[PDB]
């Protein structure tokens, strides 16, 4: 809020969804507990990367320090970094059950598991 003293994904990410700045990223519910992330794969080079890494870029720049313009950017690092954290986060649940990657617009659903929440069930 005031200053990014302690960086983190749990909140950071949530902030991105609530803000609704990036497309696809929307809260399936009002409680802002469950959301959906757009999972696509172009591969092309001429295609626009900025957008593809619109959210990923922020993640890194936020957590670490990426030199924009001087240091050569690498989507792999960003995607891998986040993609990995998403799963690494034990406070996150896999809603793949509802996830739809076989439709017009593919996306992966996830549930933010709290601390005082029932691990099992």
Swiss-Prot record:
Recorded consequence of changing residue 80 to R: In IMD131; pathogenic; the orthologous mutation in knockin mice recapitulates the patient phenotype; affects DNA-binding transcription activator activity; the mutant is able to bind GATA-containing sequences that are not recognized by the wild type and is able to activate transcription from such non-canonical sequences; results in decreased transcription activation from a reporter construct containing canonical ISRE; increased nuclear localization; increased DNA binding
DNA-binding annotation, residue ranges on this chain: 8-114
Free-text tissue specificity from the UniProt record: Lymphoid cells.
Record's note on what induces expression: Not induced by interferons.
Role this protein plays: Transcriptional activator. Binds to the interferon-stimulated response element (ISRE) of the MHC class I promoter. Binds the immunoglobulin lambda light chain enhancer, together with PU.1. Probably plays a role in ISRE-targeted signal transduction mechanisms specific to lymphoid cells. Involved in CD8(+) dendritic cell differentiation by forming a complex with the BATF-JUNB heterodimer in immune cells, leading to recognition of AICE sequence (5'-TGAnTCA/GAAA-3'), an immune-specific regulatory element, followed by cooperative binding of BATF and IRF4 and activation of genes.
Quaternary data: Interacts with the BATF-JUNB heterodimer. Interacts with BATF (via bZIP domain); the interaction is direct. Interacts with SPIB. Interacts with DEF6. Directly interacts with NLRP3 in the nucleus of Th2 cells; this interaction enhances IRF4 ability to bind to the IL4 promoter and is required for optimal IRF4-dependent IL4 transcription. Interacts with SPI1.
Disease: Multiple myeloma: A malignant tumor of plasma cells usually arising in the bone marrow and characterized by diffuse involvement of the skeletal system, hyperglobulinemia, Bence-Jones proteinuria and anemia. Complications of multiple myeloma are bone pain, hypercalcemia, renal failure and spinal cord compression. The aberrant antibodies that are produced lead to impaired humoral immunity and patients have a high prevalence of infection. Amyloidosis may develop in some patients. Immunodeficiency 131: An immunologic disorder characterized by recurrent infections, including infections with opportunistic pathogens, and low IgM, IgG, and IgA serum levels, low plasma cell counts and abnormal T-cell subsets. IMD131 inheritance can be autosomal dominant or autosomal recessive.
Protein name, UniProt field: Interferon regulatory factor 4
Portion held of the full protein: 23 to 130 of 451
